[PDB]
Design a protein around this ligand. Structure first.
Ligand SMILES: CNCc1ccc2c(c1)[C@@H](CC[C@H](O)CO)[C@H](CNC(=N)N)[C@H]2NC(=O)C(=O)Nc1ccc(Cl)c(F)c1
Ligand SMILES: CNCc1ccc2c(c1)[C@@H](CC[C@H](O)CO)[C@H](CNC(=N)N)[C@H]2NC(=O)C(=O)Nc1ccc(Cl)c(F)c1
Ligand SMILES: CNCc1ccc2c(c1)[C@@H](CC[C@H](O)CO)[C@H](CNC(=N)N)[C@H]2NC(=O)C(=O)Nc1ccc(Cl)c(F)c1
Ligand SMILES: CNCc1ccc2c(c1)[C@@H](CC[C@H](O)CO)[C@H](CNC(=N)N)[C@H]2NC(=O)C(=O)Nc1ccc(Cl)c(F)c1
Ligand SMILES: CC(=O)N[C@@H]1[C@@H](O)[C@H](O)[C@@H](CO)O[C@H]1O
Ligand SMILES: CC(=O)N[C@@H]1[C@@H](O)[C@H](O)[C@@H](CO)O[C@H]1O
Ligand SMILES: CC(=O)N[C@@H]1[C@@H](O)[C@H](O)[C@@H](CO)O[C@H]1O
Ligand SMILES: CC(=O)N[C@@H]1[C@@H](O)[C@H](O)[C@@H](CO)O[C@H]1O
Ligand SMILES: CC(=O)N[C@@H]1[C@@H](O)[C@H](O)[C@@H](CO)O[C@H]1O
Ligand SMILES: *[C@@H]1O[C@H](CO)[C@@H](O)[C@H](O)[C@H]1NC(C)=O
Ligand SMILES: *[C@@H]1O[C@H](CO)[C@@H](O)[C@H](O)[C@H]1NC(C)=O
Ligand SMILES: *[C@@H]1O[C@H](CO)[C@@H](O)[C@H](O)[C@H]1NC(C)=O
Ligand SMILES: *[C@@H]1O[C@H](CO)[C@@H](O)[C@H](O)[C@H]1NC(C)=O
Ligand SMILES: *[C@@H]1O[C@H](CO)[C@@H](O)[C@H](O)[C@H]1NC(C)=O
Ligand SMILES: *[C@@H]1O[C@H](CO)[C@@H](O)[C@H](O)[C@H]1NC(C)=O
Ligand SMILES: *[C@@H]1O[C@H](CO)[C@@H](O)[C@H](O)[C@H]1NC(C)=O
Ligand SMILES: *[C@@H]1O[C@H](CO)[C@@H](O)[C@H](O)[C@H]1NC(C)=O
Ligand SMILES: *[C@@H]1O[C@H](CO)[C@@H](O)[C@H](O)[C@H]1NC(C)=O
Ligand SMILES: *[C@@H]1O[C@H](CO)[C@@H](O)[C@H](O)[C@H]1NC(C)=O
Ligand SMILES: *[C@@H]1O[C@H](CO)[C@@H](O)[C@H](O)[C@H]1NC(C)=O
Ligand SMILES: *[C@@H]1O[C@H](CO)[C@@H](O)[C@H](O)[C@H]1NC(C)=O
Ligand SMILES: *[C@@H]1O[C@H](CO)[C@@H](O)[C@H](O)[C@H]1NC(C)=O
Ligand SMILES: *[C@@H]1O[C@H](CO)[C@@H](O)[C@H](O)[C@H]1NC(C)=O
Ligand SMILES: *[C@@H]1O[C@H](CO)[C@@H](O)[C@H](O)[C@H]1NC(C)=O
Ligand SMILES: *[C@@H]1O[C@H](CO)[C@@H](O)[C@H](O)[C@H]1NC(C)=O
Ligand SMILES: *[C@@H]1O[C@H](CO)[C@@H](O)[C@H](O)[C@H]1NC(C)=O
Ligand SMILES: *[C@@H]1O[C@H](CO)[C@@H](O)[C@H](O)[C@H]1NC(C)=O
Ligand SMILES: *[C@@H]1O[C@H](CO)[C@@H](O)[C@H](O)[C@H]1NC(C)=O
Ligand SMILES: *[C@@H]1O[C@H](CO)[C@@H](O)[C@H](O)[C@H]1NC(C)=O
Lengths: 335, 335, 335, 335
């Protein structure tokens, strides 16, 4: 254990809130990246017991509390008011770094599921650039897997633990509230979603080799988890995924049961002002949306699922630590 | 430097907030105190750089935070609203104690002014019972000097430094909002205040030997310090002292120039709901006062003064550290 | 996170080194403990991330450095020598206690594994009496589980994580060197060992589907961990467990295949002077053993195991922090 | 509050013990000296409450414990023996450095007494090169004030607080045991000492504006502080200063009353093997001196004085943190 520090390519002249946070919170990044390969050493990792995740989680909570200040923050019977201006919000990469006396070991196995022994490992000073993208159900703007799709989970047997599906080919998603000021929509290409959900069904079938693999929507919870919720240019998008997690993989082949038009799935979305926070147990009230075309052009790079004759997988999330684990699985800080 | 702990006679059954906080934060007072005298040993004390004061200060800050919750708390544009019930509020004595391996040296030189060598020292484990009374200008319900009045200051030649006047006999002040509901008043017996300012002028004259001494009201600043402000029964009293600090000591003889009637000085008071906090920079808003007759009967045991041919002294205070120093002056925690 | 203090009933007249250390380092035990029970609760515990264990670890390191002074201590090629008298050495219980305002919550579910939620928790200010017994492989003189033998592990699937087996009924082990001066031996009743190993195999079989469950001696490494090593009356015993951790649990029955005679397993032991320290990475050299009959009559109360068709368990140990966790599986410092 | 790191031009091939400690304890100094000057800015410093002093203190304690091992070390009833080889001993400069996310502000006021506000401040990453020279009474081989001679004290009215006299012109002292094997002597040119003490009396008279300034020898105590004690090439010199601190500054002129011969003051020295340690309380016993001619040619750069019709000043010291303060007064560590 230690206390890592962050490095970023943030610019002090920029008024984007990730930049403004990182300029006072993190140190300039290193153009001199030294990495030492060692093929004979083998080390053990547990991405689900990684304290880098806790440190980044606290850092990102700080980022949001200093950047996305709500008009009202309701917590523990208390109500906190403050100025809630519209801001320029677009996440930037953050590197996490070990101080003197410590190193970060990085697993070089491209098929590593994030748990157990990795026997090609290198030593580095900082992780790669990580954008702190808060979202659920879908992981956006992450890093793709270099080889095959990877299924990660602390206990695939345990239906309560979140499953992280690490994709190897990105799936583009475009969400837009165009120029009702709270109604929006996302567009996704049905063909790419079809083939990536087919190969995800294959990878999931290998861990469930008399079991049909079904994809169905979230059954219940707060709207933040029953929809694809995320933040776009400052506004809180809640996008219905009934037509996205909706299909069946049986006998090696995927059939999509959700609904398209001219080859595209469109999710209906609402820009909400009352938010159930992820940083703590409480609610946050923001100002109505800004004017004009609000669009985010993101890459789906991962999935957050929960498992329930056959096995059924629904979208999940909510604990943004899982978001940070999707990217910090390779890393472990050693002395 | 060590972490001290508190000890009190707080009762588990008492709804009064000091008792409630002490049942959870302090231990019961040792009914078998031990004190060992060292009459040949001489040790150096400095009441103005005493870590015991910082410790008691933080203890009382959290006492007030857990007990006297305001309806609104405003810190530079940010407003926290909570439940603000009326509570029962009567300060109880607190003893401060060193853990194992540490002791508390107590200077028993009844002449001691707070700084320098003390030659009659002793060793205890805990201080005497100290009521944490939050006040300006007047020190209430403290413990009196044994022989003559003591004048304490970090640096008498520095007019910015607060002077603490430690009285050897107490002046009774009775303060009441009787049964506009925010109007109250305070009665002081003018002959006792006469004699007290007489001999305080004597003792200050010794330190400024012509220089006719002059007592005058506070020059300016926030209402909390320009008045005798205190808390009685939970309500915040602000009482004008322009008739109380109003005199001239000249040619060894005292001269009170404030208005009086039937031998008693009466201070006009307001119960205010908007407060400038002492714990931190900010404002605190409380509920309208409770119904009925609100009375506190206190012993003025000390004065807080500021010095501006002739020397003029005006009531001061504000930094509650000085309130604690008025009682922690004769102690020092040694390993 | 806080600084706890120890309590003991050490007596100042005792020449025994645990007493000598505790009288100077701990406070007399308080004789009316109020276990404030509660019953709508669950709080999460993690015996494998517990600051209590580290503070106890540091205090025991200090005790051993002040009490069991080696003739030589070699640390990083640096050799410091000092007086190495033979001392009276018999561990005494130490209660650990939270200071003023902080509490120790305690889980009373007597099937509680050590990590996860707990449901019948009380509150005290001090733990029970814990004797700091330093040993490997077998835990001695601990507290027994009341109901059933419990298996504790940071992660039962990571073979590299130490497994603690909290036993139920103590197995008496008697270790002696009689009146070669460094040759000793220890007797264990083989029937009770067979019984206990059957129960341990039963519960490890419910934790591991149902492969045959073999017990084998320690792989390799320093003698301190390859043997049951402990300290008795100051002398360092290294006892061979090859005829002890040696059986096969198959068919729901346990078959012991270590050598016995007349119904007793006897381990062969050497008393050593050169010791690989547990407090630090270094070596200590002690004096030749004392004259006379050196024997300890101890209760095996727990086991320290390591896992590698079938699963094999071997005696582990080495990190005395796990010895502390076995009696602080816990409790918890709370405010 | 942070943990600094050192930086030295030490050589990994020099057997000199400061070099050998600094190659395994320090990083290389960098020709990266980016000084940042900020005149608008102005900050508060207190050279007497500066954690850099304590961090350098512990570092130098570590160096001495690893470099000048005594044959015998007596502390608290315990006696520790180790090899005590004669080593090559010559202190080298050490830079102290704030890690990433921290900076070191340095006050560029050349008249700064070390306490209060400084209007010209600059930020760098590391202090200037500071030789950790352990001595009493006279500060050796340090940095010189750039304009006037500076008087430093956390309280000049408290006679117990050490006074540091920062000289602007260095006074040469040559100490030698030539080729009784423990008899040595120091030569100091009497006229430069005459001028140095006259201007020191001038500054002290400014701060004591009557008060004939009188330099007298140290009253009493351990030999370490009643003499100018220091270490030269590994040997512990104790040199008598009764002919050094022995003069009177009256009506603006200084008269040296110390015994002089041929215009040079000669201090008699003993090389001692039993030393009262400065690191902790206890004694340390070293081997007899080496053979040959043992000489240090040093620059007196400051004084350590203590104040008793007049004011008397005697040489003092013995808390090597004051030695560190004489160089670490300019600096303060910031986030
Ligand atoms: C089986 N799953 C367990 C599960 C389920 C739901 C939730 C958690 C855990 C919490 C995580 C706690 C964290 O670990 C503490 O640090 C969190 C509690 N907080 C409440 N108010 N309920 C709650 N998640 C959120 O509400 C959340 O993600 N909202 C949100 C906002 C903005 C955006 Cl853009 C967004 F995409 C999402
Ligand atoms: C020359 N004098 C310096 C001086 C002057 C005024 C004041 C200080 C210092 C502060 C002390 C800071 C402390 O040291 C930090 O811990 C404090 C700042 N805080 C603000 N909001 N301005 C401010 N004092 C108060 O406002 C205060 O006493 N109010 C108060 C309330 C209730 C009761 Cl019953 C009462 F009797 C008093
Ligand atoms: C897979 N297991 C990991 C493993 C393995 C072996 C060992 C550790 C860890 C260390 C623990 C370090 C500690 O955590 C730091 O505080 C310790 C290192 N130290 C060295 N010299 N090698 C080393 N254990 C010991 O050597 C030890 O127990 N000896 C000992 C003496 C007297 C008695 Cl009576 C006794 F019963 C035992
Ligand atoms: C009014 N003055 C207070 C005063 C007075 C004398 C002394 C202190 C304080 C201690 C400082 C404690 C430190 O702060 C803890 O870290 C120290 C205690 N230690 C003992 N054994 N008495 C003791 N000083 C020394 O003995 C010392 O300097 N010897 C020494 C050796 C080698 C060399 Cl070359 C040298 F030039 C000097
Ligand atoms: C070693 C062991 O028994 N571990 C289990 C753990 O997997 C489980 O989550 C917990 C639930 O309380 O019970 C325990
Ligand atoms: C509680 C006790 O004294 N002994 C128990 C025994 O009753 C139980 O049948 C067995 C099951 O493993 O565990 C042991
Ligand atoms: C660590 C140790 O002592 N191992 C020994 C082993 O070498 C030996 O073969 C066996 C037979 O007694 O006993 C055990
Ligand atoms: C240690 C091991 O793996 N197996 C042992 C074997 O070596 C030994 O000869 C036998 C004697 O009882 O006990 C079993
Ligand atoms: C290893 C160890 O400490 N064993 C002890 C033994 O020496 C002692 O006789 C007995 C009674 O206290 O408790 C057990
Ligand atoms: C991940 O791989 C390890 C082996 O390296 C295995 O023990 C574990 O069960 C795997 N987990 C999943 C979810 O595949
Ligand atoms: C991604 O992984 C799948 C297997 O899950 C594989 O079939 C596909 O070819 C991969 N895509 C690549 C390597 O571009
Ligand atoms: C550690 O890895 C195991 C598998 O090796 C995994 O099941 C578990 O979720 C991980 N985290 C733990 C046990 O805290
Ligand atoms: C996962 O959970 C199952 C049952 O919930 C359990 O048998 C297994 O030991 C757990 N851990 C793993 C598979 O690492
Ligand atoms: C998603 O849409 C379907 C149909 O439009 C609806 O039945 C479902 O309740 C919606 N879910 C959410 C979370 O709005
Ligand atoms: C899949 O989508 C269709 C409409 O597109 C909907 O009727 C159906 O219920 C969905 N499947 C679910 C919710 O399991
Ligand atoms: C993903 O990245 C692109 C380009 O940086 C950006 O336009 C988009 O808004 C991002 N999506 C999210 C959710 O931040
Ligand atoms: C307090 O006593 C000390 C000790 O002599 C003295 O130096 C100081 O001036 C005194 N201060 C006051 C305010 O009396
Ligand atoms: C209080 O002190 C004054 C001197 O300041 C003295 O004249 C007076 O008699 C004292 N009163 C007592 C001791 O009651
Ligand atoms: C210094 O000591 C004097 C008397 O001992 C005291 O009045 C003063 O407050 C102390 N501190 C200073 C001058 O900063
Ligand atoms: C006290 O004040 C005087 C002038 O106001 C000043 O000379 C002195 O340095 C101050 N501090 C002390 C005496 O500690
Ligand atoms: C106190 O009252 C007088 C007259 O009654 C007034 O001049 C003065 O301003 C008042 N001071 C405060 C602080 O209210
Ligand atoms: C003293 O009190 C009178 C009222 O009785 C007032 O007029 C006078 O201004 C006061 N003295 C001051 C404020 O200095
Ligand atoms: C002082 O003490 C009396 C009696 O204990 C009490 O009535 C009064 O309210 C106290 N004053 C303050 C300011 O607490
Ligand atoms: C140092 O200068 C400050 C003014 O910045 C002054 O307050 C302090 O008394 C001075 N101290 C000494 C020892 O000269
Ligand atoms: C050193 O300072 C003294 C006064 O303290 C001054 O008279 C002398 O000229 C200075 N020497 C220099 C600046 O070289
Ligand atoms: C200083 O020393 C010289 C001899 O080197 C002597 O002649 C001179 O008078 C002395 N001056 C003073 C002021 O003591
Ligand atoms: C220094 O020398 C003088 C006379 O030479 C002597 O009286 C004094 O005691 C010596 N000081 C010490 C500390 O030995
Ligand atoms: C100064 O030196 C002379 C001769 O060395 C000595 O007699 C005198 O006592 C000294 N002054 C002191 C010790 O104050
Ligand atoms: C002072 O520096 C010189 C030159 O490096 C050196 O010879 C001498 O030993 C140093 N003095 C001390 C006391 O270390």
């Amino acid at each position: 254990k230690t206390t890592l520090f962050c490095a970023s390519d943030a610019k002090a002249y920029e008024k984007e809130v990730h930049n403004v946070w990182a300029t006072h919170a993190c140190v300039p990044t290193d153009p001199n990246p030294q990495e030492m390969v060692l093929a004979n050493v083998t080390e053990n990792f547990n991405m689900w017991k990684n304290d880098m995740v806790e440190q980044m989680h606290e850092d990102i909570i700080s980022l949001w509390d200093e950047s996305l200040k709500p008009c009202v923050k309701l917590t523990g019977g208390s109500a906190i008011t403050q100025a809630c201006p519209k801001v320029s919000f677009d996440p930037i990469p953050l590197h996490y770094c070990a101080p003197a006396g410590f190193a970060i070991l990085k697993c070089n196995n491209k098929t590593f599921n994030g748990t157990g022994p990795c026997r090609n490992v290198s030593t580095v000073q900082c992780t790669h650039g990580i954008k702190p993208v808060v979202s659920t159900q879908l992981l956006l703007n992450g890093s793709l897997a270099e080889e095959e799709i990877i299924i990660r989970s602390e206990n695939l047997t345990n239906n309560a633990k979140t499953i992280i599906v690490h994709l190897n080919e990105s799936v583009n998603i475009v969400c837009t509230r165009p120029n009702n000021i709270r109604q929006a929509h996302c567009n996704i290409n049905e063909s790419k979603w079809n083939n990536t959900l087919q190969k995800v069904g294959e990878e999931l079938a290998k861990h469930f080799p008399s079991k049909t693999i079904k994809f169905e929507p979230s059954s219940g919870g707060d709207l933040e988890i029953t929809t694809h919720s995320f933040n776009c240019r400052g506004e809180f998008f809640y996008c219905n995924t009934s037509d996205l997690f909706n299909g069946t993989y049986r006998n090696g082949t995927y059939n999509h049961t959700g609904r398209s038009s001219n080859g595209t799935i469109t999710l209906q979305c609402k820009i909400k002002q009352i938010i159930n926070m992820w940083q703590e147990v409480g609610r946050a009230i923001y100002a109505p949306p800004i004017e004009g075309e609000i669009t985010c052009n993101s890459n789906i790079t991962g999935l957050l699922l929960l498992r329930d004759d056959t096995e059924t997988f629904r979208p999940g999330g909510g604990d943004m630590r899982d978001n940070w684990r999707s990217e910090l699985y390779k890393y472990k800080v050693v002395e």
